[PDB]
Amino acid sequence: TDRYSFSLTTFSPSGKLGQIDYALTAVKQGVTSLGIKATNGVVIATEKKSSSPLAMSETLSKVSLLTPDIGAVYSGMGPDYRVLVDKSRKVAHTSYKRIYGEYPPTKLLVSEVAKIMQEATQSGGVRPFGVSLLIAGHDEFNGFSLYQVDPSGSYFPWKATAIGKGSVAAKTFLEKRWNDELELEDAIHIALLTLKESVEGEFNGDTIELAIIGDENPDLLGYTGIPTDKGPRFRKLTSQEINDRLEAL
Amino acid sequence: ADVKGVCTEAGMYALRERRIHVTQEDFELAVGKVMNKNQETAISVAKLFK
Amino acid sequence: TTIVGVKFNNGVVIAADTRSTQGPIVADKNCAKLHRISPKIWCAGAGTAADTEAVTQLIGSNIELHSLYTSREPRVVSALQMLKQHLFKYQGHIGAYLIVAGVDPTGSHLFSIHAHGSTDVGYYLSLGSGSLAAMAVLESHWKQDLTKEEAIKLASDAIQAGIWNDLGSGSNVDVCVMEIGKDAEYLRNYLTPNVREEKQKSYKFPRGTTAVLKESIVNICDIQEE
Amino acid sequence: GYDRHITIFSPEGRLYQVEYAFKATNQTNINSLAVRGKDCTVVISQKKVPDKLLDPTTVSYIFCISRTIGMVVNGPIPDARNAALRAKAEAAEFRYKYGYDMPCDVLAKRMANLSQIYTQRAYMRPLGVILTFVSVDEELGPSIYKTDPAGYYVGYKATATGPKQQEITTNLENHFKKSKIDHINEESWEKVVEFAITHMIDALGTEFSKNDLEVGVATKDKFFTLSAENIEERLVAIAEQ
Amino acid sequence: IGTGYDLSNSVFSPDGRNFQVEYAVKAVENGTTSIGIKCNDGVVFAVEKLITSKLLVPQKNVKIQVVDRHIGCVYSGLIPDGRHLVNRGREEAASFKKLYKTPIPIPAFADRLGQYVQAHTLYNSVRPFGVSTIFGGVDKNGAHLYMLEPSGSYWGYKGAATGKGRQSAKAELEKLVDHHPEGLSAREAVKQAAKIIYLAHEDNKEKDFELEISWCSLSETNGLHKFVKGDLLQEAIDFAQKEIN
Amino acid sequence: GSRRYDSRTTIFSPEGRLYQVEYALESISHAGTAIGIMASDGIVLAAERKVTSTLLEQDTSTEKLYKLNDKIAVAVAGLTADAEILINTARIHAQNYLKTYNEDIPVEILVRRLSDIKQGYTQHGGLRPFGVSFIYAGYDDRYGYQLYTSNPSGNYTGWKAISVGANTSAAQTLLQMDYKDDMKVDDAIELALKTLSKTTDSSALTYDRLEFATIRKGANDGEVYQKIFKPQEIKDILVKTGIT
Amino acid sequence: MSLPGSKLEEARRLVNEKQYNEAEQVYLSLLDKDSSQSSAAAGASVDDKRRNEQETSILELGQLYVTMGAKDKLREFIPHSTEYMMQFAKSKTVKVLKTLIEKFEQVPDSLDDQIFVCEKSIEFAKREKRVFLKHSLSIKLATLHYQKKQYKDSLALINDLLREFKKLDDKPSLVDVHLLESKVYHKLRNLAKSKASLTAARTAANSIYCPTQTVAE
């Protein structure tokens, strides 16, 4: 049956919450991922990793679209991301796409997935999720915005940040290379450059999954002729397109 | 500690080039090398213990 | 309020008129009755207005979720299977009468659904209250094999003559053309046959014709500063 | 004292409980090798049958989950039937609510979520099996998806399972490097059965008789298992290679 | 290594094994001998039923219970626990009989119990069963015979055995299948079930026993499970004496 | 057995006392400092972030100031995740009392409701506490400005001035030596920056580590106006008080 | 797609078959076709929309220029090849431009001329684009002022590049600035300061992100 209705996150005696502390260890075991916020886009970036070359990378995904205006990319455990991406799409429809008829702002959706976090830092028979997500997006009133949702269930707004095993070195590189005007194309050159120093294995347009939240493409809209709506702002970069910008280093 | 390492390390480049005194350029070689060595072990979190 | 769907070789065309009526009174001269279940699956609605909008919305969500969790393009047949189930469990209380047309990876499809959760297939389908009128013109002039210039005419003529043989019809005939391998072409107001006759007398009143018992100001434009 | 006794984290960030499942998988000693042909997918596996008194027809590790989806099981046979039942069931349900037969991609992600929930309970034991789902899809062609007790999965150009699978991984990798084409090519499915059987005879350093093989092939719109009578006609076909 | 690993069962031990369930195979080891001979036309169950005292009523206790009208189920180990597993499959079988109006296939029924024993190993709150069953019967697809381990494992069988005398039984069933690897008669197989219960009574030759025999056969019983009684049961008894002489 | 893995979070110790509520308070002493002073013409709320970074967006952050209703905003110090939940409960309850009585909810009612919620978890359910400490700034007609602190035990006490979070002993002592009964918001603005300056662990206090909001009756038409100051006005008012 | 390949392949072939005079007309023909196809005025001669097709076309316009071999005409094309670069306006704008400058420098068409082209590029990069592209071009522009023997002009970029990569340190592009600095101060002929900056390059090339080439030079 179920008799597990007691929390397994409990207070530790010198203070702190022991499960959430541990779970943050599990975040820093995984891949390295970063995000740079420009003035007209946000770029997010990650490295693919397989068991062998026999795995395909084509069917693999690590950057997902939650809404067309808001994407996510993680560093931490593969399993936990996989379910939590799906719960994120679900609450985004059920609590703002049926109620206010449209996709939710980035501040609002972030706040909902931090509450998904929160109810596995608590309740019985559950431990914390073992990912930390960047949830980058664009809304119409807080601009481009990059967030970091964490195992604690807090969120922080950021302007550029990194998470994963190369986090310590990555952000110092990014502190010194940040500037208060970047274009999205100029943003890319930073993110690739940094992600090249955290890879030591192979480097290709097939092994770096790169995503932009640029500006609107009506070629992914699927249709034309309602000018009220404007196509996916989210646009995952194909292997061919990424490869040119790799040579551009 | 590091400050004292920049002085010994500069004295060691006086030997390398076969100078007779420590020059200012010996300080430029010192500061860089000692720093690259200090920061690598902090940010890679590796020790002198194996 | 009529909807036509005409299946052709290269895709499928669906067309309807824009007049909403709330009984004898004409509630809106233009209203769009063509809904978007997904990018390649437009539908339109007939029957009660308040009941169509609300469940082409509800499954709009549900099919979108489906499409992202499978990580593959939607099929038409899916939208229809979720819709049939959703209407039958209320046992025909919610009056939906949709004609759901759509391109997907398995050719093109065109379907009709009725309020009890009846579904029929057809290469010409007809629904709404001006159905009977639209059927008559269609059935003379159809034949196998139509291209998009042919088909889009035929849907537009059937709706056009459908206007003058129905009273709940009126205004402009909208068309939406879904080709195979192509982004659907929403040609809003394709044929406009009716235009309001220009009034022979203006009716603009002077200032102060009306009387003012009292007046005052509410300020809610801002929320006041310190 | 209790951190490696329910699926909570450890001071390391690891879940040992989840990890022990991965150490249970390889205790059955059953190997599998699965390659994607040109328009088919062929999977060949051992069928160890210890005693005389087992009725051999019943011993299996190829489960039919759909017309288009087979599922090949490495790990203990109780966990195998419970993963297999849950799969057939979910396949029926998908058909029911979405009106087409289930594509493999979706079954791969569906059994993955159930794996994920099983390691975020405290009253559920993660099923210790590695299942490989072989198919021929009409949108994504022949595929291989391998799920595992944690809830990760990835597609495969080929994959192998079992305790001698390190060996099998080596043969297949060389094969796809030298040739430089991601999938094996050959038009007829019968002959992808032949290439596949050679690669298991080279890798394990053992020959195989008809009762030791049990072969599943997903071709277009059908999954069948070869009778042991028909598998010999393939074993003879290796004698002229 | 860590201490734990034997107080529940949705732990795994550090070697990926169970505990309780590995401990559960030892609960089954104290049980009564029980064999099954798969004949071509059906199954013959036979079970050693000990007369443990002189105060028991002879031929009024049974451990062979019928499920539906055509599947015999016969168990050893924990006897109360064993009736509960048969009881679950009488509810399951009855549900199948209403929904599809055919007697539940032996492969369908095997599938239904199997899950059940496996389900109790997935929780920390339910005790894993400590019985092994031998069950089979005759359905429309022929005769089949199954043994279901306490681990929630089952397989096809041509002869299966359980209890204390499982060592002698397993060895004595290899001989019978090498006498007739081309099949054997269901009339005949009664008499062989008798012979392999008396040779397996030699781990347990301390006491005295009642042999209970049953069969489900297509050509003598019309594919319905009945008990071997009357004169036929006494012939098998006299057969066993002459063999062990 | 399930019983084997139960914490028993919610029995007493031999002292008569609740280990897990005590420990919860232990961890809030790590968390960010928040001080509230009730002037006689406002309440000044000011809290210093526990983390800082220069890449961190800190210009539209409001992770310490949260508005519950139009007239009651709180400062947060503790497990932010736990707090986000009860802030969103609070907001539901405050709006609810307005829906059903058509009357501004008193400060007393909302504060007591939130307290009893914390209280439910230390009382029963076998669950961990919500480690949150709120300082409530609120206005009602009845009792004017009202000031309040709540703890994880689910107990509420009035204040005129109070400090929770890190360096509680230090902050509390400082307030007391300075505090007068005749103070307006200007004196309060100066004291709130100033105590924070003495408890700080940065080499100098700066605006990007300060969050700051007031509630003044000195806004027009005898109305309470909630103002959460923007970081560029905070930097301004920081030049006035001559801290930098 | 089909016709652009045919023409490029045939033009190279002819250089190494018949003649480079004869080959040059093939390249001329290829050039006209690319332009026209671009703003739909011949299509692409294989049907279908621009899409992928224009991506293909660009990679072999980067094979057209400075690959046919030296020539007075080929020269003259280079001040105009940079116009098509500003037009393409996708991912590959930077990729095409980089490989083109390097190739233009290698073939010596005159000091004069390289500088003209470089300046136009840094200028373009001065408005919009990437500061990364701009600053990279600055290192090349500086090189060309060194080849010119205007060492006052080179020095101005060098000093500029340097202040900037002391806010963007631990960088291989700053090894390049230090090494170039040493070259200028050799040929202004004072060796005090020549030594001083070379000292700066050795400490900062010990990063394992520096190639075989930097160390060799």
> What domains are there in chain A, each with its CATH number?
1-249 (3.60.20.10)
Q: Dig out the tokens for C33 from the structure.
A: 């009755």
Contact yes or no for C161/C125 (Cβ under 8 A): no
- Interface partners of chain C (CB pairs < 8 Å, 3 or more) are A, D, F
∠ at Cα F168 (F163, F173), nearest 5°? 80
Q: Residues 94 to 123 of D: which have CB under 8 A from any E CB?
A: 123
* Residues counted in chain E: 245
Q: Considering just the CA atoms, what is the radius of gyration of chain B in Å?
A: 13
Q: Which amino acid is at D185?
A: N
**E106 three-class SS:** helix
C119-121 and C124-128 as β-strands: parallel, antiparallel, unpaired?
unpaired
Torsion angle, CA of C16/C17/C19/C23, rounded to 10 degrees? Answer: -60
Beta-carbon pairs below 8 A across chains C and F: 13
Closest CA to E34 of E111, E175, E145: E145
**In sequence order, which residues have a C-beta less than 8 Å from that of residue G183 and are 6 or more positions away?**
G146
| Fold assignment, F1-244 | Glutamine Phosphoribosylpyrophosphate, subunit 1, domain 1 (3.60.20)
Q: Among residues C1, C2, C18, C56, which one is catalytic?
A: C1
Write out the two tokens for A23.
């779970």
Side chain identity, residue G19: Q
Which residues, in sequence order, are bridge partners of residue D131?
D73, D147
Contacting residues for D105 by C-beta, under 8 A, at least 6 apart: A59, C70, C71, C72, D137, D140, D143, D145
Q: In chain D, whose CA is at the least distance from the CA of E176?
A: D53
Q: What are phi and psi of A47, to 5 degrees?
A: -110, 140
Q: Hey, how many other C-beta atoms are within 10 angstroms of the C-beta on D184?
A: 23
Q: Nearest chain A Cα to E126, which residue?
A: A1
> How near does any CA of chain F get to the CA of A170, in Å?
12
Q: Which residues pair with C16 in a beta bridge?
A: C3, C174
CA distances, F12 to each of F17, F20, G53 (Å)? 5, 10, 76
Give the C-alpha separation, F80 to F27, whole Å. Answer: 12
Token digits of residue F88: 């969103």
Q: How far is CA A95 from CA A104, E44, F239, in A?
A: 9, 63, 44
Q: Is C102 exposed, middle or buried (0-12, 13-18, 19+ CB in 10 A)?
A: buried
Rounded to whole angstroms, the Cα distance separating E143 from E218 reads: 9
Tokens 């004595």 correspond to E172
Closest CA to G118 of G64, G164, G178, G78: G78
Touch of C by B (3+ CB pairs closer than 8 Å): no
Query: How far is G75 from G110, CA to CA, in rounded Å?
Result: 9
Q: Nearest CA to CA, how far is B42 from chain A (Å)?
A: 10
> Over the Cα atoms of chain G, what is R_g?
20
A83, closest residue in chain D (CA to CA): D113
Minimal-distance CA residue of chain B relative to A172: B43
Task: Kindly report the backbone phi and psi dihedral angles of residue F147, in degrees, each rounded to the nearest multiple of 5, phi listed first.
Answer: -125, 140
CA distance C93 to chain A (A): 21
Given an 8 Å threshold on Cβ–Cβ distance, is E4 in contact with D4? yes
In Å, how far is G199's CA from the nearest CA of chain B? 7
Specify the 3-state DSSP secondary structure of E72: strand
Q: Judge whether F2 is closer than 8 Å to chain D, CB to CB.
A: yes
G209: which chain A residues are within 8 Å (Cβ-Cβ)? 197
CA A120, distance to chain mean position in Å, is 19
B-chain residue closest to G192, CA distance: B25
> Alpha carbon A40 to chain centroid distance?
18
* Amino acid sitting at position E56: L
Residues of G in contact with A197 (CB under 8 A): 209
Tally of CB atoms within 10 A around E142: 11
User: Which among E70, E62, E107 is positioned nearest to E215, based on CA atoms?
Assistant: E70
Is E127 within 8 Å of chain A by CB? Answer: no
Q: Shortest Cα distance from A233 to chain D (angstroms)?
A: 26
Q: How far apart (Å, rounded) are the C-alpha atoms in residues A58 and D154?
A: 10
Find where tokens 């050039």 sit.
G31
Q: In a 3-state reduction of DSSP, which class is residue G158?
A: helix
* Token pair recorded at residue A180: 């208060």
- Interacting residues of F14 by C-beta distance below 8 A, sequence separation 6+: none
Q: How far apart are CA G205 and CA G198, in angstroms?
A: 11
Cα torsion for G148, G151, G156, G158, to the nearest 10°? 90
DSSP E strands, chain G: none
Record: contact F5-D123, CB cut-off 8 A? no
Do residue D123 and residue A51 have CB atoms under 8 angstroms apart? Answer: no
- In order, the DSSP letters of A12-79 are -BTBSBHHHHHHTHHHHHS--EEEEE-SS-EEEEEE---SSTTB-SSS--SEEEEETTEEEEEEE-HH
Provide CB contacts within 8 A for F205, sequence distance 6+. Answer: F48, F193, F196, F197, F243, F244
Asked if the bond preceding F20 is cis, omega within 30° of 0, the reply is no
- Per the CB < 8 A criterion, the answer to whether C52 and C115 are in contact is no
Q: With an 8 Å Cβ cutoff, is F61 touching chain A?
A: yes
Cβ within 8 Å, pair F218-C226: yes
Torsion sign over Cα F50, F56, F60, F61: negative
The owner of tokens 């409001």 is F62
* C-alpha–C-alpha distance, residues D193 and F195, integer Å: 80
Q: CA B4 to CA B6: how far, in whole Å?
A: 6
d(CA E79, CA E64): 11
Given a contact cutoff of 8 angstroms between Cβ atoms, the answer to whether G141 and G177 are in contact is: no
Q: Nearest Cα to A174, choosing from F209, A166, G138, A39?
A: A166
Q: Which residue has the tokens 């699926």?
A: D7
* Sheet with A70-76: strands ordered across: A63-67, A70-76, A131-138, A144-149, A155-158
> Minimal CA–CA distance to D208: which of D33, D4, D3, D9?
D33
CA F79 vs CA A120, A133, C88, F76, F100: distances in Å: 14, 19, 48, 9, 32
Query: Residue D100: which of D223, D225, D221 has the closest Cα?
Result: D221
Strand pairing report for F132-140 and F72-78: antiparallel
| Calculated CA dihedral for residues F205, F208, F210, F215, nearest 10 degrees | 140
β-pairing, A234-236 vs E159-162, is unpaired
Secondary structure letter of residue E33 according to DSSP: P
F:2-31 residues touching chain E, CB 8 A cutoff: 2, 4
Q: Which of D7, D109, D154 has its CB closest to that of A55?
A: D154
* H/E element, A118: helix A106-118
Q: Which two tokens stand for residue F25?
A: 């308070």
Q: Do chains G and D touch (3 or more CB pairs under 8 A)?
A: no
Inter-chain residue contact G206 with B28, CB threshold 8 Å: no
Instruction: Collect all residues of chain D within an 8 Å Cβ-Cβ radius of residue C85.
Output: 97
C interface mutation test: which of D93, D95, D96, D98 has the most C CBs within 10 A? D98
| Distance (Å, whole) CA E1 – CA G193 | 65
**Which residues numbered 1-50 in B keep a CB inside 8 Å of some CB on G?**
25, 28-29, 32-33, 36
Mention every residue, 6+ apart, whose C-beta is less than 8 A from residue D42: D34, D35, D134, D189, D192, D193, D196, D215, D216, D217
Q: Is A150 left (phi over 0), alpha (psi -120 to 50) or beta?
A: beta
**A48 with A159: CB under 8 angstroms?**
no
Give E129's Cβ-side CA count (13 Å radius).
29
Q: Are D75 and D129 in contact (CB under 8 A)?
A: yes
Q: How far is CA G133 from CA A248, F117, G120, in A?
A: 9, 59, 13
Whether D161 contacts chain A with CB within 8 A: no
If DSSP codes are grouped into helix, strand and coil, which group holds residue G26? helix
- Distance from C-alpha of D18 to C-alpha of D6, rounded to nearest angstrom: 9
Of G60, G82, G74, the closest CA to residue G20 belongs to G74
**Interchain contact D163–E (C-beta under 8 A):** no
Please list every residue in chain D whose beta carbon sits closer than 8 Å to the beta carbon of residue A22.
9-13
Structure tokens, C185: 């072409």
Q: Are strands C184-191 and A223-224 parallel, antiparallel or unpaired?
A: parallel
Let me know: does A43 contact A37? Beta carbons within 8 Å.
no
For tokens 């009208």, the residue is E69
Q: Is the dihedral of CA E113, E115, E116, E117 positive or negative?
A: positive
- Least Cα distance to F21 among F172, F132, F161, F158 occurs for F132
Q: Where are the beta strands (DSSP E) in chain C?
A: 2-7, 11-17, 20-22, 25-28, 34-38, 41-47, 96-103, 108-113, 119-121, 124-128, 173-179, 184-191
Neighbours of G170 (CB within 10 A): 14
Tell me the residue length of chain B.
50
Nominal resolution in Å?
4.1
Instruction: Let me know: does D161 contact D130? Beta carbons within 8 Å.
Output: yes
CA distance F4 to chain E (A): 9
Nearest one of G180, G208, G204 to G194, comparing CA atoms? G180
Helices and strands, number each (H, E), in chain E: 6, 10
- Is the four-CA dihedral E202, E204, E206, E211 of positive or negative sign? negative
Which one, of G31, G52, G49, lies nearest residue G40 by Cα?
G49
Give the amino acid at D103: P
Length of chain C: 226
Q: What are phi and psi of E17, to 5 degrees?
A: -95, 170
User: Would the CA dihedral through G128, G130, G133, G134 be positive or negative?
Assistant: positive
How far is Cα of residue A232 from the mean position of the Cα atoms in its chain? 17
Distance from CA of A226 to the nearest CA of C (A): 7
Report the alpha-carbon distance of residue A63 to residue A48 in Å, rounded: 10
The yes-or-no answer on residue C1 being catalytic is yes
DSSP for C62-118, written as a single string: HHHHHHHHHTSPPPHHHHHHHHHHHHHTTTT-S-EEEEEEEE-SSSEEEEEE-TTS-
In chain D, the N- to C-terminal Cα span, in Å, equals 59
- Which strands form C124-128's sheet, in the order they lie side by side? A223-224, C184-191, C173-179, C11-17, C2-7, C124-128
User: Are D126 and D149 contacting, i.e. CB atoms less than 8 angstroms apart?
Assistant: yes
Q: What is the rounded radius of gyration, in angstroms, for the C-alpha atoms of chain F?
A: 19
Could you say which residues from 31 to 50 on chain G have a Cβ atom under 8 Å away from some Cβ of chain A? Answer: none
Contact list, C187 vs chain A (CB under 8 Å): 225
Residues of C in contact with D100 (CB under 8 A): 75, 77-78
SS3 state of residue A181 = coil
Structural element, H or E, at residue G22: helix G20-38
Experimental determination technique: cryo-EM
Whether B40 contacts B23, CB under 8 Å: no
C107 three-class SS: coil
For residue D154, which of D89, D99, D113, D109 has the smallest C-alpha distance?
D109
CA distances from A240 to A247, C131, D142, G50 (A): 12, 51, 24, 16
- Number of Cβ within 10 Å of residue E121's Cβ equals 23
* Per-residue tokens: C36: 């978007």
Nearest-angstrom CA–CA distance, F214 and F226: 6
Q: Assess D6–A contact: CB distance below 8 Å, yes or no.
A: yes
For residue D34, give the nearest of D236, D225, D216, D224 by alpha carbon.
D216
* C151: region left, alpha or beta (phi > 0 left; psi from -120 to 50 alpha): alpha
The β-bridge relationship of strands D69-74 and D62-64 is antiparallel
Cα Rg of chain A, angstroms? 19
Distance (Å, rounded) from C-alpha F92 to C-alpha F89?
5
Beta bridge partners of C28: C20
Among E138, E185, E177, E160, CA closest to E39: E185
F117 Cβ contact partners less than 8 Å away, ≥ 6 residues apart: F86, F89, F130, F154
Contact of D75 with D68, CB cutoff 8 Å: no
* Pair A90, C65: CB distance under 8 Å: yes
Partners of residue F105 on adjacent β-strands:
none
A184-A190-A194 Cα angle (round to 5): 145
Cα–Cα distance measured from residue E174 to residue E199, given in angstroms and rounded to the nearest whole number:
14
Kindly state the greatest CA–CA separation across chain A: 63
F1/E contact by beta carbon, under 8 A: yes
Contacts of A43 (CB under 8 A, 6+ apart): A35, A36, A184, A187, A188, A191, A210, A211, A212, A213
Which residues does A202 contact at the CB level (< 8 Å), separation at least 6? none
Nearest Cβ partner for A90 among C40, C58, C65: C65
Give the number of other CB atoms < 10 A from CB of residue B19: 13
G131-148 and G172-187 are packed helices; what angle lies between their axes, rounded to 10 degrees?
20
What's the rounded Cα separation, in Å, for the pair C19 and C28? Answer: 6
d(Cα E69, Cα E72) in Å, to the nearest integer? 8
Nearest Cα neighbor of G56 from D182, A220, A244 is: A244
DSSP D156: B
